[PDB]
Design a protein around this ligand. Structure first.
Ligand code: SF4
Ligand code: SF4
Ligand code: SF4
Ligand code: FCO
Ligand code: FE2
Ligand code: NI
Ligand code: H2S
Lengths: 283, 482
């Protein structure tokens, strides 16, 4: 990219998020986050990092949204809570009117080129939707469908995702759009999503079948303490068998470690995370 | 001039969802209300689970400070399980968590706060902004701020590599569990941690600490506002031996000009002005309850109102530095003399008024970052490559435990009660809960609400100092509400 190249507008809305999906993106090695922001996208609204604030920030987003109707990308971090008329997530106030996450997704969702549901919360509901919750935390695709909003959704799950999955999905989409235009390009993206809406380049391979400890699993050699790095981690709770992600290759944080080497996989990219992956520390 | 009432929602360049509403009269804030507008309910989500799951689930309170929640949770679980963490595991935990102090403070100053004082480049997300943003730096010093913001993006990423070396990944570590740390440090990985640490040290010493004092010297008026109650809490953090009695930050309370001991039984959480059922007001965390009431009249936040023996206290780097009164960094001593005419040797030599101020909180955070370098260096000398870091304790049928630590933003505790081998109750009292809470049942304001009183608003169309004050506290509303 270049400082003077074409960069599409992006709005990043946080619902019931922890900001970990934003932070993981800040960890991108290549391109660096500075290069993403200055050379790849135009991040017009993001509550954690943007200069302006309050109603002025909301109105800026609304002005860009009008100028780029049908053409902006909407990132969602966190789930969308529907209980109590949306009151469990208020994201702003303008014109003396509070704006819930429900309101915001009904406003901007219909007018986005595509919605990127970043993280397991946005993609699938995640921890806010897990047993014992009471906010009506809802995944992006379900919320949009329930409200008759047909805008395409791409899921980029993980808790958090790896930055390369986020940036890489953006790059996949922008390449398809460069070759085919917006509608043709998004059709090419949809062709490479799995049944859970995830791009098969990053999510098309199973952890366990590619794991360096697979021989130990097959031999029945299981570590009995976390610090035994020779044996398989299955008896300690590893969910690699049930998990579709490329962590075994890509690893984490500049390649310095990954969950299975360090401890166990908890299945964080899967639609049933956390409840279907729990308990974490026994098979 | 008369009254103007100003609402800011969202307050940006913080973590999470915050509305601030201030009443301005004659150019000064005279009242304030803070609203945490997003709730998830971790304390109810956790019930019924295998207690060991907590040290993963709780991290999702916050992707900025997950290591703090991991730490509080594993300490609570260690106590409840009777797990005796090996010495080398204690040190490994300190290396995992300490690296995120560096990350979080650097993120806060540069990526959240610095735009309060520095004009970024002419493209989103650095524009548009207030037309009169009160950006006072020379072209050269402004450019240094921008250049350092950009460099800090790489430095904070390197800090997360440090976390992940023994923590597995970050955000959301895998490497802390009940019983210790899941990965023994190897000699080779300790070399890799130290090499990254050297780069972070050089940035902190040469760029970050100097820039905070230098920018502060162009905003000397910002040491004269934001005092609030001038009352602080520290609960202790980073154990230095296996006794549980010695910590890098030792506990204490400071209020009404007096140092006092910290007794956790004096914590109560009030809810009159919070969206929780009225019959849950006033509970200590060992008996805490979380019953949302989003339609309750008069309430304005999902943050509970914690009070310490009735006192409204603040937490964070200023609180810890004030309570513990360490020596100032060499470069801080020098720049205080050169740029401010102040001769100081220890933190309290700044005086109460300047320490408990908008800019004083930024200075305290920079000084604390420097202080953490020495702690991490010590742990790198103390750790033993190859020595076991974990025990594997059986889950108890019935137990309770509390973990106390200091997150980057301030005091954090987790309490767990286990019954029938499952979580019966789990209560969290977090840092930004202490800072960003609403009024208590007697109408006494939270710490940031009170610190807003007196903030200057000489231009109601560009009321920049309201959120500047808020950002000095490094709010994290995901943490505050959970
Ligand atoms: S997916 Fe995980 S890391 Fe991302 S917002 Fe949700 S809890 Fe946070
Ligand atoms: S460590 Fe986990 S992913 Fe690897 S072989 Fe064992 S069960 Fe499978
Ligand atoms: S190894 Fe498992 S828990 Fe770790 S990031 Fe990959 S999918 Fe998530
Ligand atoms: N630091 C941090 Fe997070 C907050 N506030 C916690 O605890
Ligand atoms: Fe709580
Ligand atoms: Ni936090
Ligand atoms: S943290």
């Amino acid at each position: 990219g270049t400082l003077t190249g074409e960069r599409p507008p992006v709005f990043w809305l946080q619902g019931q998020g922890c900001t970990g999906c934003s932070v993981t993106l800040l960890n991108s090695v290549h391109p660096s986050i500075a290069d993403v922001l200055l050379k790849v996208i135009s991040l017009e609204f993001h509550p954690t990092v943007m200069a302006w604030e309050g109603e002025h920030a909301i109105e800026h987003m609304r002005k860009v949204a009008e100028k780029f109707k049908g053409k902006f990308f909407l990132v969602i971090e966190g789930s969308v809570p529907v209980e109590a008329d949306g009151k469990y997530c208020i994201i702003g106030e303008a014109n003396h009117h509070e704006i819930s996450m429900v309101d915001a997704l009904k406003e901007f969702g219909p007018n986005a080129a595509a919605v990127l549901a970043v993280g397991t919360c946005a993609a699938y509901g995640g921890i806010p939707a897990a047993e014992g919750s009471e906010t009506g935390a809802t995944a992006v695709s379900k919320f949009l469908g329930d409200n008759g909003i047909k805008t395409p959704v791409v899921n980029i799950p993980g808790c958090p995702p790896h930055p390369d999955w986020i940036v890489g999905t953006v790059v996949l989409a922008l390449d398809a759009i460069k070759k085919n235009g917006l509608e043709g390009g998004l059709a090419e993206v949809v062709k490479v999503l799995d049944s859970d809406g995830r791009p098969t380049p990053f999510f098309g391979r199973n952890i366990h079948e590619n794991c360096p400890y697979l021989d130990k699993y097959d031999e029945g050699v299981m570590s009995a303490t976390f610090t035994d790095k020779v044996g398989c981690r299955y008896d300690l709770g590893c969910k690699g068998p049930m998990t579709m992600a490329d962590c075994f290759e890509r690893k984490w944080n500049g390649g310095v470690n990954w969950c299975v080497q360090n401890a166990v996989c908890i299945g964080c990219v899967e639609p049933d995370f956390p409840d279907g992956k729990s308990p974490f520390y026994q098979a | 001039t008369g009254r103007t009432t100003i609402a800011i929602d969202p307050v940006t360049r913080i973590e999470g969802h915050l509305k601030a509403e201030v009443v301005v009269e004659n150019g000064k804030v005279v009242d304030a209300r803070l609203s945490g507008g997003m709730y998830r309910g971790f304390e109810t989500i956790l019930r019924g689970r295998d207690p060991r799951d907590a040290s993963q689930i709780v991290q999702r309170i916050c992707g900025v400070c997950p290591t703090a929640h991991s730490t509080a949770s594993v300490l609570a679980l260690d106590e409840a399980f009777g797990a005796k963490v090996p010495n080398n595991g204690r040190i490994t935990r300190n290396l995992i968590f300490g690296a995120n102090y560096l990350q979080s403070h650097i993120l806060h100053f540069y990526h959240l706060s610095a735009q309060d004082f520095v004009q970024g480049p002419d493209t989103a997300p650095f524009v548009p902004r207030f037309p009169k943003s009160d950006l006072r730096l020379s072209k050269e010093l402004n450019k240094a701020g921008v250049d350092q913001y950009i460099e800090a993006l790489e430095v904070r990423r390197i800090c997360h590599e440090m976390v992940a070396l023994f923590g597995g990944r970050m955000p959301h570590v895998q490497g802390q569990v009940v019983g210790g740390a899941t990965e023994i440090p190897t000699k080779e990985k300790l070399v890799e941690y130290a090499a990254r640490f050297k780069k972070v040290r050089d940035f902190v010493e040469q760029k970050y600490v100097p820039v905070v004092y230098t920018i502060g010297s162009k905003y000397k008026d910002m040491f004269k506002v934001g005092q609030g109650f001038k009352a602080a809490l520290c609960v202790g953090a980073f154990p230095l031996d296996n006794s549980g009695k010695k910590h890098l930050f030792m506990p204490g309370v400071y209020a009404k000009g007096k140092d006092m001991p910290f007794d956790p039984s004096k914590i109560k959480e009030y809810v009159k002005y919070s969206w929780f059922a009225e019959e849950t007001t006033g509970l200590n965390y060992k008996e805490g309850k979380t019953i949302p009431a989003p339609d309750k009249a008069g309430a304005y936040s999902f943050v509970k109102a914690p009070r310490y023996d009735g006192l409204s206290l603040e937490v964070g780097p200023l609180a810890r530095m004030w309570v513990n009164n360490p020596e100032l960094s060499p470069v801080g001593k020098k720049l205080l003399k050169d740029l401010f005419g102040i001769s100081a040797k220890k933190f309290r030599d700044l005086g109460e008024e300047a320490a408990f101020s908008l800019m004083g909180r930024h200075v305290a955070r920079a000084e604390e970052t420097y202080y953490m370098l020495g702690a991490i260096e010590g742990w790198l000398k103390e750790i033993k490559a190859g020595e076991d870091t974990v025990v594997m304790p059986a889950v108890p049928a019935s137990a309770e435990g509390t973990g106390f630590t200091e997150a980057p933003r301030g005091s954090l505790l987790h309490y767990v009660k286990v019954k029938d081998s499952k979580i019966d109750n789990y209560q969290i009292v977090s840092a930004s809960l202490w800072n960003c809470n609403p009024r208590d049942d007697m109408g006494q304001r939270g710490a940031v609400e009170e610190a807003l009183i007196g903030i200057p608003v000489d231009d109601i169309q560009n009321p920049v100092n309201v959120a500047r004050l808020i950002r000095a506290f490094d709010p994290x509303l995901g943490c505050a509400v959970h």
